[PDB]
Design a binder for these strands. Structure first.
Ligand SMILES: [Zn+2]
Ligand SMILES: [Zn+2]
Lengths: 605, 85, 161
RNA sequence: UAAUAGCGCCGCAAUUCAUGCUGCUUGCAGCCUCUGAAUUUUGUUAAAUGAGGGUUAGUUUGACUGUAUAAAUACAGUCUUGCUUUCUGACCCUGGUAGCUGCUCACCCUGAUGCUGCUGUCAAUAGACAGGAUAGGUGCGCUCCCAGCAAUAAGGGCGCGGAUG
């Protein structure tokens, strides 16, 4: 999995774009809105929320009677498919971030029940804490998942108290019979995490997009002309009147690569037309850096044509493509203001012939497993047999190789690992360490990786404060000049990713190790709240202003973006990314060294 | 709101010679401003700095109407009929 | 001998704010001091101005009960009963009921109360002689308007019937 | 006249190290010459930072083939398209005319993450004219400090009218 998106503007006539804008902003986005609303009020909805899997076909079932509707009719089939796919993905996400949140809440409740002090454990067990300690050592002799299973499995007060004592230290036997206030703060922190997860689980339903803003305009008339009767209704009117009038239709996900048919203009320019809309021809305006992808698209489609469809589109360097509208600055009709943009998702691994072989092996394994899975059932539907036929068709067609560039992949020395330490102040720090002999081959810092570019790092912090102030000075004036250094941060993290992967290449690394951070901006919020609740007992504003800057620094600390960028570059290059635990205490260099060493140690089994 | 308009609306919602600030007059002023602003909001859909003002005027008029309703329902009804709210 | 405080017996229908103010003035305490003694922090200083954004909890009232030595149910009997809406501002007073007993009634702060049921008088929201809004009930060192020094019991004959 | 003091950032030093340099003694010895790392430690006659607003389908970072090259990388050949961003420059400006509309002010006091702060000329009014990014303070900025204003933070005071459930 090394999917990356390239983009290109699409240029055509004013009418060719009026057709698309009318056909999406007026018929496709309303279809997505109605599909979302219907998905919400479906009777099985609360069942889906219990799982993370919305059923495979439900969204299409609510769409089949919707295609013939008076206000949703007059669309290509592969665009009803776009709407179905968008809504299905929205609710495939929304049922996976609420199921895992519920799992976290359940686990945190179990841990809150787990947590007892030394005195509390003594009074519950009815024995001296020394017996608790001895039995806890005994049970540690007989990871944490096993202990939680043991606790949830037994009903004895003594054994369960032993589990509690063990997991209080984290499968450790610490004999420092002190710091009861520390336990009080820890229990307070766990309770705050419980409260925050509960506050999260009451989430808004997927909104959808209202381009017409009919509700806004109607509510303005209701609020001005009439008078509300209670506060709870005037508040709803106010909330509606302040909502954001979105003005961009949903994209068009074309999950089939061939739905975009490519051609060469009489001027040599590349051109696209999509399945269902062939009278609409769009001319590709890319940049030369992205030219080879589009030329590969045209060459691959022509190569499939010239073999009488003996070649499997499915090894195409194109996987799918969104067809979005950007936002333009100025005035005029929307088709003349917003720039149509094609976002093609390409499997970079397929560019080389050698990587194409890897992709071929992956697909030929997964799809023959699919064939075996369908061959056990005896239902033998007709379209099910059509699917079975297509699977063997892809099997047969996959062994016909297109002519692609050749690069002998990347032979990686398994010993030499790369450990990356992230931090609030040192965004990254890399240690190239050989595992056979623990001596680090090399160290680099945030000034070494950003060489000649290190000035950016300071300029990121110098102005992200400045912009943070400028926004504040413009909000009170209600000017739209709210700017932020998100692009600068993204550029800096991309530079770091390139530097780290280049360093791994130079020393012939066999892996890259990144820490598993977990919920990092939440644990610090909980800890700061717990500390401020004693530092400020009854003053909530004081509990908030306490460690404000530290918390906002954590929240804007983009560990996830940096990890994703490094993962993208390593996958593009072939470095096998692993994971480890960042040591809690230590210098960044030692942190990275021990991180990579631990990753190597755990990998061995 | 223009001074001439305020004087005219005070006189035309007047209860006597000197009643500026009577709940009827305050509701009349707020209603006049909101009625002028609704067209501006039909046209300029980006002027949020006026959106906050509109919300404030709506809430002020709502409070005034509730107060006058609790005090004197008769005056409340005749007022809400005069303004057609 | 046993640890003690200048205990005050609560009135009938007195406010939590006014009762805490009388408790403080009879103990020469401060809102921060009373909160620290009770163990709930500056929450007390909030209650003196009726900001019950997070309704006074059972724990936050048991902790007070430990200090002022008044039963927790008797404490809840000066907050509005569950579901009843009160206005934290303006502070309202009936002159006759103050002349009868020098306290501030929580029932005066209800959204639904405009008349004294045992006096048939429209209760006062501001001083009837100088139009000065009344302070927080806990801040009533004595029964007089701060700006005009008019006794609270006097205002009974200025407030309308 | 004032910007004291604090905080952050750069540099300049000084020290100790190596991820450096040297040496083979190949993991040890020294050294701080470069490169860096960690402190503290000053703001030099200065080093480096540097935040008033804008303007290019801008340039470069590109693909394939072959050679040397293990490879990077270089060279040679063929092709080239304008996407979205980050800098560095250069240049322009410090806006006008119309409308529609929001907020804030009886009058005080304190004073906010409040506003303002450039050069010259004419005034020395409160404003024009020319210029102009060096633009109050410290090497550079701040929500910090100075100066003026402060109704448009918040709080308190407080006059007369209307309302006063
Ligand atoms: Zn009474
Ligand atoms: Zn008075």
């Amino acid at each position: 999995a090394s999917q990356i998106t390239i983009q290109a503007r699409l240029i055509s006539f004013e009418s060719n774009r009026q057709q698309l804008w009318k056909l999406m902003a007026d018929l496709n986005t309303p279809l997505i809105n109605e599909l979302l609303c219907q998905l919400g009020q479906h009777p099985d909805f609360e069942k889906w929320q219990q799982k993370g899997k919305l059923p495979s076909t439900v969204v299409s079932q609510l769409c089949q009677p919707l295609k013939t509707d008076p206000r949703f009719a007059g669309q290509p089939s592969r665009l009803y498919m776009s709407a179905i796919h968008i809504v299905d993905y929205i609710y495939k996400s929304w049922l996976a971030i609420q199921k895992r949140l519920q799992q976290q809440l359940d686990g945190k409740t179990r841990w809150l029940e787990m947590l007892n002090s030394d005195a509390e454990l003594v009074e519950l067990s009815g024995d001296t804490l020394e017996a608790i300690r001895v039995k806890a050592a005994e049970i540690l002799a007989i990871l944490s998942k096993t202990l939680f299973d043991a606790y949830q499995e037994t009903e004895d007060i003594k054994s369960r108290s032993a589990i509690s004592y063990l997991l209080k230290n984290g499968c450790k036997l610490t004999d420092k019979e002190e710091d009861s206030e520390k336990f009080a703060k820890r229990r307070r922190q766990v309770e705050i995490q419980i409260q925050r997860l509960t506050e999260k689980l009451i989430s808004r339903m997927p909104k959808g997009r209202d381009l017409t803003n009919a509700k806004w305009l109607e509510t303005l008339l209701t609020a001005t002309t009439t008078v509300a009767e209670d506060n709870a209704q005037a508040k709803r009117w106010q909330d509606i009147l302040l909502t954001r009038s979105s003005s961009l239709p949903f994209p068009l996900v074309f999950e089939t690569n061939e739905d975009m048919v490519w051609s060469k203009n009489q001027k040599g320019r590349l051109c696209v037309h999509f399945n269902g809309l062939s009278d609409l021809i769009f001319e590709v305006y890319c940049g030369n850096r992205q030219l080879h992808w589009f030329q590969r698209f045209l060459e691959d489609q022509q190569t499939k044509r010239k073999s009488k469809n003996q070649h499997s589109s499915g090894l195409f360097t194109l996987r799918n493509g969104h067809l979005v509208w950007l936002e333009g600055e100025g005035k005029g009709e929307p088709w003349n203001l917003h720039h149509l943009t094609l976002y093609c998702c390409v499997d970079n691994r397929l560019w080389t012939e050698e990587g194409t072989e890897i992709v071929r092996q992956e697909k030929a394994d997964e799809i023959t497993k699919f064939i075996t899975n369908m061959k056990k059932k005896s239902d033998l539907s007709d379209t099910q047999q059509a699917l079975i036929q297509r699977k063997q068709s892809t099997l047969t067609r996959i062994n016909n190789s297109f002519e692609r560039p050749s690069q002998p992949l990347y032979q990686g020395q398994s010993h030499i690992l790369v450990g990356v330490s992230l931090g609030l102040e040192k965004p990254a720090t890399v240690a190239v360490v050989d595992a056979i002999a623990n001596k680090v081959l090399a160290y680099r810092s945030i000034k070494q990786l950003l060489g000649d570019n290190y000035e950016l790092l300071n300029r990121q912090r110098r102005q992200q404060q400045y912009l943070s102030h400028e926004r504040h000075k413009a909000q009170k004036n209600f000017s739209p000049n709210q700017f932020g250094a998100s692009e600068l941060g993204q550029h800096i993290d991309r530079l770091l990713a390139k530097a780290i992967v280049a360093l791994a290449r130079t020393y012939k690394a066999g892996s890259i190790v990144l820490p598993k951070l977990g919920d990092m901006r939440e644990v610090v919020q909980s800890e700061i709240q717990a500390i401020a609740e004693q530092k400020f007992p009854g003053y909530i504003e004081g509990q908030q202003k306490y460690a404000k800057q530290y918390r906002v620094n954590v929240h804007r600390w983009s560990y996830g973006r940096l990890i994703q960028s490094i993962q993208s570059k390593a996958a593009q290059t072939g470095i096998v990314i692993e994971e480890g635990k960042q040591p809690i205490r230590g210098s960044p260099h030692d942190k990275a060294k021990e991180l990579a060493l631990s990753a190597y140690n755990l990998r061995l089994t | 709101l223009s001074t001439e308009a305020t004087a005219k609306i005070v006189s035309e919602f007047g209860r006597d010679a000197n009643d500026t600030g009577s709940t009827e007059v305050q509701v009349a002023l707020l209603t006049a401003q909101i009625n002028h602003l609704q067209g501006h909001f039909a046209e300029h859909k980006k002027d949020h700095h006026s959106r906050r003002g509109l919300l404030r005027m709506v809430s002020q008029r709502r409070k005034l109407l509730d107060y006058l309703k609790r005090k004197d329902v008769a005056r409340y009804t005749q007022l809400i009929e005069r303004l057609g709210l | 001998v046993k640890p003690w405080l200048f205990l005050i017996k609560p009135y009938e229908g007195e406010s939590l704010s006014h009762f805490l103010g009388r408790f403080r003035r009879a103990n020469h305490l401060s809102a921060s001091g009373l909160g620290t003694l009770a163990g709930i922090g500056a929450i007390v200083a909030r209650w003196e101005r009726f900001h019950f954004n997070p309704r006074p909890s059972q724990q936050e009232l048991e902790a007070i009960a430990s200090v002022v030595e008044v039963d927790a149910q008797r404490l809840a009997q000066m907050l509005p009963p569950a579901g009843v809406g009160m206005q934290h501002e303006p502070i309202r007073l009936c002159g006759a009921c103050y002349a009868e007993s020098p306290c501030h009634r929580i029932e005066w702060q209800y959204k639904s109360v405009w008349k004294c049921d045992r006096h048939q008088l429209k209760i006062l929201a501001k001083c009837p002689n100088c139009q000065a809004p009344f302070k927080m009930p806990a801040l009533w060192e004595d029964g007089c308007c701060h700006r005009c020094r008019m006794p609270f019991a006097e205002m009974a004959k200025l407030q309308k019937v």
